[PDB]
Amino acid sequence: DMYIERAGDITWEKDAEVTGNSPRLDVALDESGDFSLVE
Amino acid sequence: GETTDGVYRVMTRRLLGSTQVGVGVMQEGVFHTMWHVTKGAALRSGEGRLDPYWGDVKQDLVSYCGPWKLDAAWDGLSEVQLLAVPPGERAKNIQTLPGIFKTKDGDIGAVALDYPAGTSGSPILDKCGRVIGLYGNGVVIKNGSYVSAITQGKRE
Numbered sequence: 001d002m003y004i005e006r007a008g009d010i011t012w013e014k015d016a017e018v019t020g021n022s023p024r025l026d027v028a029l030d031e032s033g034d035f036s037l038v039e
Numbered sequence: 040g041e042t043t044d045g046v047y048r049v050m051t052r053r054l055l056g057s058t059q060v061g062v063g064v065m066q067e068g069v070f071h072t073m074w075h076v077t078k079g080a081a082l083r084s085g086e087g088r089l090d091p092y093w094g095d096v097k098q099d100l101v102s103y104c105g106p107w108k109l110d111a112a113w114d115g116l117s118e119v120q121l122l123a124v125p126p127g128e129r130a131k132n133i134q135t136l137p138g139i140f141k142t143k144d145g146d147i148g149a150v151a152l153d154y155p156a157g158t159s160g161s162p163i164l165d166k167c168g169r170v171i172g173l174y175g176n177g178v179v180i181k182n183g184s185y186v187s188a189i190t191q192g193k194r195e
């Protein structure tokens with residue numbers, strides 16, 4: 001049985017940790033909602 | 040139960056102890072999460088019950104108590120923040136410049152940030168604090184790292 005618990009406000013944080021790259025990828029989305037890489 | 044706007048953990052007691060299966064957003068009295076998190080099951084909030092209202096396996100989204108309310112979109116240029124809520128850890132904002140998933144039906148923003156699967160449903164925000172989508176449905180690339188789509192619904 002699933003339950004929810006509050007974890008915070010939804011707010012932009014000034015000076016948050018900045019990380020992650022920005023890849024441009026060719027992808028396909030199937031009927032099951034699963035993404036796959038097209039190559 | 041609790042209906043205050045904000046980010047919430049989706050928990051279960053079916054397995055060992057209390058396990059976090061995902062995350063969601065409460066906005067305008069509607070709870071929003073990814074379909075793979077709940078599989079469309081009812082949810083509990085204290086003594087109250089949340090029934091599914093709308094869902095779609097292909098979009099991998101579901102809303103509870105009313106229709107999908109989130110309609111902000113990534114502008115295709117600016118940095119965004121993932122408000123990551125990892126299992127057993129405090130909510131934390133992470134800023135990033137999204138990449139792009141290019142599909143036969145158009146382009147979608149993507150965030151290359153890696154978190155446990157139980158972080159699925161954490162919101163991605165624009166600079167105004169608006170939810171432009173949820174984290175947790177994506178792909179594994181050449182190196183083995185994860186890239187999630189910026190998954191957004193449609194506000195009817």
Ligand SMILES: C[C@@H](Oc1ccccc1C#N)C(N)=O
Nearest residue numbers: 029098142144145147191192
């Ligand atoms: C835009 C995207 O498909 C969607 C359309 C509407 C709502 C959600 C999604 C997803 N995921 C695509 N594959 O191009």
Ligand SMILES: C[C@H](Oc1ccccc1C#N)C(N)=O
Nearest residue numbers: 153154155156159175179185
């Ligand atoms: C590779 C995939 O990982 C995720 C799934 C959903 C959300 C985040 C991640 C990550 N990181 C899995 N567990 O199969």
